[PDB]
Amino acid sequence: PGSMAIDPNSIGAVTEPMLFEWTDRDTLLYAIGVGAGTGDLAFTTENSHGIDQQVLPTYAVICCPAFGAAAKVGTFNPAALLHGSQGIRLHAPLPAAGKLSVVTEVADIQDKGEGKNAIVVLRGRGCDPESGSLVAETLTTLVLRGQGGFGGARGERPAAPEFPDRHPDARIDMPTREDQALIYRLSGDRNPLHSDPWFATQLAGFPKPILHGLCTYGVAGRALVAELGGGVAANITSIAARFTKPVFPGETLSTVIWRTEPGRAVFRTEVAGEARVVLDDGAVEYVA
Amino acid sequence: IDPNSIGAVTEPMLFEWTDRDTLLYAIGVGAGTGDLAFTTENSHGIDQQVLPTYAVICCPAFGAAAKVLLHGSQGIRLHAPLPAAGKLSVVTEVADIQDAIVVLRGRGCDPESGSLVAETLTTLVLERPAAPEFPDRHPDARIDMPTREDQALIYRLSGDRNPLHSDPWFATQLAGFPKPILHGLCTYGVAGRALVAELGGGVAANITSIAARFTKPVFPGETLSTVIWRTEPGRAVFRTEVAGSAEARVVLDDGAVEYVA
Ligand SMILES: [Cl-]
Numbered sequence: 001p002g003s004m005a006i007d008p009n010s011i012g013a014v015t016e017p018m019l020f021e022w023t024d025r026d027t028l029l030y031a032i033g034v035g036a037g038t039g040d041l042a043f044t045t046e047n048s049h050g051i052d053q054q055v056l057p058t059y060a061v062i063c064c065p066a067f068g069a070a071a072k073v074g075t076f077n078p079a080a081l082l083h084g085s086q087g088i089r090l091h092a093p094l095p096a097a098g099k100l101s102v103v104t105e106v107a108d109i110q111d112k113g114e115g116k117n118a119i120v121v122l123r124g125r126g127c128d129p130e131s132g133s134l135v136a137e138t139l140t141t142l143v144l145r146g147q148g149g150f151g152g153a154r155g156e157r158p159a160a161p162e163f164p165d166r167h168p169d170a171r172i173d174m175p176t177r178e179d180q181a182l183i184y185r186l187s188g189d190r191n192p193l194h195s196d197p198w199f200a201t202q203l204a205g206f207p208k209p210i211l212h213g214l215c216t217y218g219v220a221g222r223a224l225v226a227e228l229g230g231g232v233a234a235n236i237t238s239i240a241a242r243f244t245k246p247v248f249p250g251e252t253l254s255t256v257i258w259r260t261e262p263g264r265a266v267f268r269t270e271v272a273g274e275a276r277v278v279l280d281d282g283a284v285e286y287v288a
Numbered sequence: 289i290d291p292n293s294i295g296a297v298t299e300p301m302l303f304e305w306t307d308r309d310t311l312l313y314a315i316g317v318g319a320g321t322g323d324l325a326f327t328t329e330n331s332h333g334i335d336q337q338v339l340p341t342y343a344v345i346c347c348p349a350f351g352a353a354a355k356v357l358l359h360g361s362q363g364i365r366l367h368a369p370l371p372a373a374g375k376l377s378v379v380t381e382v383a384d385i386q387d388a389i390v391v392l393r394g395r396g397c398d399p400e401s402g403s404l405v406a407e408t409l410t411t412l413v414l415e416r417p418a419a420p421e422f423p424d425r426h427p428d429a430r431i432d433m434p435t436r437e438d439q440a441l442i443y444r445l446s447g448d449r450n451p452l453h454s455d456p457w458f459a460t461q462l463a464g465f466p467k468p469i470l471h472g473l474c475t476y477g478v479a480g481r482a483l484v485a486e487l488g489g490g491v492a493a494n495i496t497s498i499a500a501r502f503t504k505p506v507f508p509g510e511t512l513s514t515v516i517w518r519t520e521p522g523r524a525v526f527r528t529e530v531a532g533s534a535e536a537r538v539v540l541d542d543g544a545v546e547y548v549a
């Protein structure tokens with residue numbers, strides 16, 4: 001009776017194309033959502049003198065969400081990212097305003113056994129409707145705590161990235177606002193875990209509402225765009241990370257980065273205390 | 289500016305909005321985690337309320353310019369609570385051109401019933417009516433509300449993209465300010481919030497009409513201090529000031545409110 005229904009026969013199941021459309025208001029709102037301000041007007045304005053709007057590449061999680069595919073596997077929440085991971089890959093810049101035809105898919109289902117975890121992997125692909133050309137990909141890895149033993153394949157946990165044994169090449173601090181979740185939720189995730197202290201505590205057990213995991217991911221994304229992409233959105237190709245611990249709005253997010261190989265880096269995001277790691281196993285591909 | 293245009297009207301326009309819009313507006317005018325009725329829709333035991341100043345967004349008088357704010361004025365009057373999501377049939381009028389001074393009026397009705405929901409009156413500076421009278425005594429209330437340095441970047445997402453408020457280049461090299469300025473309608477909203485708390489009991493519906501004059505500019509990050517006097521039952525007058533660093537700078541003046549208790 002306490003078991004989660006997980007279809008081990010659903011790997012490969014896919015959703016029909018769904019059109020995601022947005023205007024510049026949305027991409028601007030998202031940018032402010034992940035903490036962009038007066039300091040980077042390319043992300044927070046469209047009509048400033050000598051500055052074309054750029055779109056953060058982590059916006060792929062909103063216009064190309066892999067989420068729809070979860071309904072093929074079971075009825076669990078596709079967006080509960082704790083202990084899970086999120087990856088994005090871009091093949092073109094996302095325009096300030098546009099449309100994508102998004103299809104999703106159950107990429108993988110892993111059964112670690114009764115009283116161990118289920119792992120569900122959802123993959124999103126977004127293409128320009130006219131040309132059919134591939135714009136963005138997303139990968140959402142969900143950990144369903146203790147829900148194994150449903151008749152699935154054991155599988156293989158992917159290799160964690162190698163973190164060089166030295167000091168980080170760069171530490172980018174990004175503050176967050178006490179009210180940040182209230183703006184970030186207007187990019188679509190209205191879950192009251194992030195906005196209602198009643199709910200956050202009475203159902204979820206936290207002293208206060210937690211910041212959206214994807215907001216944290218967007219903040220780390222801004223730090224990576226600055227440090228590795230030269231402040232050029234388009235120069236970040238892929239970003240992946242694992243969500244290890246929750247963040248509270250108002251906490252400062254330190255993204256520690258290591259350049260490993262031309263066009264590649266690894267990272268973590270933490271909150272200075274011993275530091276709490278909140279994003280781990282970060283991996284980035286970028287154009288020099 | 290043909291002075292022949294008085295009494296001219298635009299054909300009706302449908303203004304439509306969802307909860308995202310009214311929640312965004314409230315955050316635009318500085319509401320936060322301590323104002324869950326205005327900034328959330330699904331918080332336990334709290335129905336979303338819409339700040340009455342949202343009339344300036346859903347009942348815009350500016351349709352009438354084609355037929356023709358600092359230093360200008362804005363008034364609103366509401367006959368019903370604005371709903372979190374909804375729509376209005378809006379019609380705008382050139383109320384008066386003075387000879388440069390242009391007074392535009394908007395009226396928004398419920399499309400199904402044809403019933404009047406909101407009125408707005410927008411005075412643009414390019415008979416001057418009676419200033420309210422302020423009583424010679426210390427205010428009944430002073431309500432201080434901060435703004436964030438990014439306040440204008442949020443507020444502009446309720447429609448007004450004027451680079452005056454967002455682009456440092458435009459503001460300093462063409463418009464004559466030291467840095468971008470906060471939308472006057474934003475300051476008005478912040479004063480709106482002050483009024484709702486002090487005179488409305490936190491119930492935004494309780495504030496029926498607000499009118500004020502924009503006298504000096506505000507910059508994002510400044511604390512706006514609304515000074516309020518209860519005059520006659522169900523009525524009050526106010527100003528909104530930024531505390532000097534010096535004499536306090538008055539940014540909204542001639543403020544008059546009608547509310548219900
Ligand atoms: Cl910034």
Ligand SMILES: [Cl-]
Nearest residue numbers: 186187188308
């Ligand atoms: Cl939304």
Ligand SMILES: [Cl-]
Nearest residue numbers: 025445446447
């Ligand atoms: Cl807008």
